[PDB]
Symmetry: D3
Subunit: 78 residues, 6 copies
């Protein structure tokens, strides 16, 4: 779960950002659904859910974790 | 209207979660768009909008309703 | 000229705007959300963190301390 | 599998059409993914696969069944 | 309806191609769904339906029109 | 381009099937757009294009290549 997510983050995470309870992950062109999917599958306790577009993922942080702390965690697995 | 919505939540709502102003609903694979659409057509005053993925819907709550209160409402409709 | 294209497309495709918290919620005609959302990305506004589109609706994430209501009124006035 | 499919065709199938090995199914807005996935889970021997947009499903007929034969089959099931 | 389709093909159609009863239209990424919807709404007599990816559209030709024929016609509307 | 596609098919391709000028490829849920962009970026001479659903890809074969031939080729690259 977590090791698959980690590898794919290393492959596919271009950048991260945050606002409030939200991390925003940028990926290459066809890649966001695929990444989002590995995140969901990892089922992180600090994560409520994810929604992907083509090249963007919204990851919803579980309180009290913030979007910034979620995004920092994702950075440090890449 | 709200009728179809309540009937679909009965059939399709697997689980709820929340964070901040967001309710995150989970459905069977391939059902999230269809349920999201029903929730839009109901046009509930406490919902601003929804975004569906394949089995996840992010519901944005209208202030002052929280994601938790929103999740609590979808869950008691079935 | 990313902003001008965004401005042109808001004029054409934006049906309604709304908000909650750090989120602006934009509505478009069916099939148009993804196209407008990418024009908004392309424009790289200082106060926008990112966007996610469905079929007819866009979530636009405001950069703190800009709020979703602020982003919404700004999109609204570009219509 | 096939009960669920046939029930959903009853609710959601608005119209059919065909060309060659292809059946085109129309649904109400937001209904096509849900219907498409019911069809997939039913695993019909005459179906090769499906792709859904918002209100349109492309069903690929297994040779020698035509798109017209596949479309006629889907209609008589409503 | 057809005018909007014509105007959009002029802005969004990058290239055209075909195979059998199929026209394949290419767009910029993020623009396929929007174009397909405009094609759909124009309801051309020789088009059975469309399905959009991200930057590609499958247009289904109504027999006896071919994909090459459709693609020619779309091509000359740019 | 082709080497990346070849790596991805080994990881993501679950089954191949076909009908007429179409190869139908199945991946795990959430992997189809990712594999489909890699197929596109390989630009194979015999492929007109691809459209991805959630776990299904339609690959359009270039006349006179058939979908069965494309499918058998993709199958042997796992």
């Amino acid at each position: 779960g977590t090791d698959r997510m980690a590898r794919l983050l290393g492959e596919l995470l271009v950048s991260t950002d945050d606002s409030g309870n939200l991390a925003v992950l940028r990926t290459p062109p066809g890649a966001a659904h695929y990444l989002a999917s590995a995140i969901d599958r990892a089922a992180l306790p600090q994560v409520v859910g994810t929604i992907a577009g083509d090249d963007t993922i919204l990851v919803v942080a579980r309180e009290p974790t913030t979007g910034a702390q979620l995004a920092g965690m994702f950075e440090n697995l890449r």
